Amino acid sequence: LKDAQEKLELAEKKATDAEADVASLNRRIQLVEEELDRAQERLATALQKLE
Amino acid sequence: LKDAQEKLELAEKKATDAEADVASLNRRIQLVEEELDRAQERLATALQKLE
């Protein structure tokens, strides 16, 4: 039981950290997508003014 | 020990799933980052053309 509970603890800690990493990466994805959309809009406006 | 092993299996499956999510989300992060880099390079070229 000592080994089994130690394995349980390590697996649970790893899964929780992985979930936190997933949430952080997803919010990073949405942030970077917003920045990309703003950059594309700026590019379009600049090209029109250039022409 | 039986319950501990079952929870170990569940936790390791969930952690592997979240690790795959991490891999996918980091791939998306890098790809959108590259697209944003291209967009900002285009923006810099556009400002140069404005000048």
Q: Which residues of A touch B (CB under 8 A)?
A: 1, 4-5, 7-8, 11-12, 14-15, 18-19, 21-22, 25-26, 28-29, 32-33, 35-36, 39-40, 42-43, 46-47, 49-50
Identify the experimental approach: cryo-EM
Nearest-CA neighbor of A1 among B5, B42, B1, B38?
Answer: B1
Residue A4, class by beta-carbon neighbours within 10 Å (0-12 exposed, 13-18 middle, 19+ buried)? middle
| Chain B residues touching residue A9 (CB < 8 angstroms) | none
Resolution in angstrom units: 5.1
